Design a protein around this ligand. Sequence first.
Ligand SMILES: Nc1ncnc2c1ncn2[C@@H]1O[C@H](COP(=O)(O)OP(=O)(O)O)[C@@H](O)[C@H]1O
Ligand code: ALF
Length: 430
Amino acid sequence: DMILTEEMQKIMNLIQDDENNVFVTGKAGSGKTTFLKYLIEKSGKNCIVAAPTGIAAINAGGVTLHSLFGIPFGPITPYDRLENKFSEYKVELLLKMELLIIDEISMVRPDILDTIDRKLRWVYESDEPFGGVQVVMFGDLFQLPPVTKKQEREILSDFYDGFFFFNALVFKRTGFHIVELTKIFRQTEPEFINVLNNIRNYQVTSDELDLLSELKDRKISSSYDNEYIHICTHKADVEKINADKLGEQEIRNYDIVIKDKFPESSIPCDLHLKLRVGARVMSLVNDSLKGYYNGMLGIVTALEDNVITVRMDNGRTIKFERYTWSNTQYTLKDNEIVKEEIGSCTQFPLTLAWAITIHKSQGLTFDKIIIHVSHTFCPGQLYVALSRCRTLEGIVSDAFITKQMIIPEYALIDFERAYKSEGNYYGKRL
Ligand SMILES: Nc1ncnc2c1ncn2[C@@H]1O[C@H](COP(=O)(O)OP(=O)(O)O)[C@@H](O)[C@H]1O
Ligand code: ALF
């Protein structure tokens, strides 16, 4: 069923040359996850998939960067000394890795990449960056990174020109090609995409500005019974909203089931799923054959012991059973990198969805959203909240969206401008 686009093939063309590192970027719904899987199968290489957080690793079927490379937590300057206490099997695993795939690369502080480059050089006893391991990075540039602690910020400041992954010092020694996936498979909305590009590039016209002014509506934005999902900055506001609407009447509780070794921070579901008939909910996984995807909304119609029946917004009724997330780790089998399960957790793939945070809805899109203007805006945070919808028309705002709420991220605009001018390549050329 998959389409192989020209941009996808162009990435495959680049990684044939084992010396090419590649940054694959694109908005939500542009096929990043789907193409990552195809990339693994067609690469012809022993791949390891890693991500900066536990939930992202679980979702992409890989491991966290910190566990894979024994990275200590906290900022790391070039001259902090690394213990390098790799077990023998980890060393042999890393020595067979020909292709490192890092998902959600925009969440990766640049010192983590340099620490990875340093550990691999130690393991390969090599001066080549990343010990010569080819690196392919997936993520959306313009999704804001985790706010770097004040401590972290000024330690790394003495060594780093900025706090994005591409500020890693290793990129003064190697570089990477960039390919953007621009086909949004779910829908094709040129005007909305154009507004979004103009907001993030700080090139908004006065038309777009009032196009943005219209999105306000105090009636809809204060209602919680309308298939609009409330998108809020703060987790506390979202907890209150989903608790208020859930209420205390006729609530059933379903407990997560853990088997063996599962990191607490990697758990991708509710620990205690509290629901009730009529509760607004969101699907957390994709199962194409039962016809639900990560992000789909619905209303709870029936509650049983092993089955929650939900009427999705598209008119369908689905019988949700418990889903099992597998905690995997990589290993060798006749010098070939394979996976092995070391634990799992099991739970219905549903969560309360009258509201959701910006953070929890990263990489997701909805038909209808309500933006709770969160005054004291930051850089990019308006673009991020509008990016959670599929059209301009499904967006309703708390208050009026004003020009001063558009806070650009000039480091990202300069990065794009720089690579698009130098042949879709950043860093040192070999
Ligand atoms: N190459 C492709 N061909 C056809 N459909 C695709 C392709 N890539 C993605 N899709 C569809 O678009 C949706 C988004 O895919 P996904 O890989 O999750 O995008 P991203 O990871 O960039 O958010 C999926 O539900 C999938 O059905
Ligand atoms: F894996 Al994605 F959006 F990056 F689903």
